[PDB]
């Protein structure tokens, strides 16, 4: 792919990203001052496990749905057979959700933006997932240290999804090519901005995968104990994770 194609791919990917973000980043930064009372905290901490899970589960569900809309706008994704779109999304939608979190994370006070204000991990205590939730906070913190631009997150998460080494693909070669193109675009943009050095500092893909595995497993257990009701946007994908 030539320079102009690459530039068009970067612009396209970053526009798709911005347009499939729940909240714009300026909002998240405006509100880092708006922090939860200890009264508001204990309020959340005195919530029942189920009502808290319902909140978080619906929040996370909505997030996955924005990520699916992002994928559907990646050049070439819609041209993929339904099987492969499910393979890519089953594996990666939640990996992207986990990456997108670093936006709502404030490494200064170690808090995250949740339901209108910032709170520490203490806020989710009623779920009793301290291990998992501590891990997630560690990951966001780790991503914070890289000071991603919005453009970098867009290209990085595009590559999290468009990965040709996911088990199950049938058009593996078509994915390899969309991936190659996204890698040229990511690398170009990083060079352009003197940020090429972050490539070696990105999370090892294994760490992202395994963390996503822990997280989804836990969520599936909770979905078993206490099903929330989902109006699904990609039914063949929903059926692949909720059954
Ligand atoms: O609306 C949809 O079409 C749709 C909506 C959501 C998903 C989706 N949920 N999910 C979960 O982890 C999940 C969530 Cl976010 C909330 C409650 C329970 C669950 C669980 F049971 F599946 F585990 C995923 C993981 C990986 C990939 C896609 C998804 C998929 C499809
Ligand atoms: Mg240069």
Author numbering: 265 to 507
Article sentences:
NRs are characterized by the ability to bind small ligands at a highly conserved hydrophobic orthosteric-binding pocket located within the protein's ligand-binding domain (LBD). Here we characterize the mode of action of these inhibitors to guide an optimization program and surprisingly find a novel binding mode, thereby identifying the first allosteric-binding pocket for a highly potent, cellular active small NR ligand.
To elucidate the molecular basis of RORγt modulation by MRL-871, we performed co-crystallization studies with an equimolar complex of RORγt-LBD and MRL-871. Crystal structure analysis shows that this allosteric pocket, absent in the classical NR-folding motif, is formed by helices 4, 5, 11 and the reoriented flexible H12. The ortho-substituted trifluoromethyl and chloro moieties are spatially clearly positioned and impart a specific rotation to the phenyl group of MRL-871 and address hydrophobic sites in the allosteric pocket. Hydrogen-bonding interactions exist between the molecule's carboxylic acid group and the side chain of RORγt residue Q329 as well as the main-chain amide hydrogen atoms of residues A497 and F498. The unique conformation induced by the binding of MRL-871 prevents interaction with cofactor peptides, which typically bind RORγt through a conserved LXXLL motif, at the AF-2.
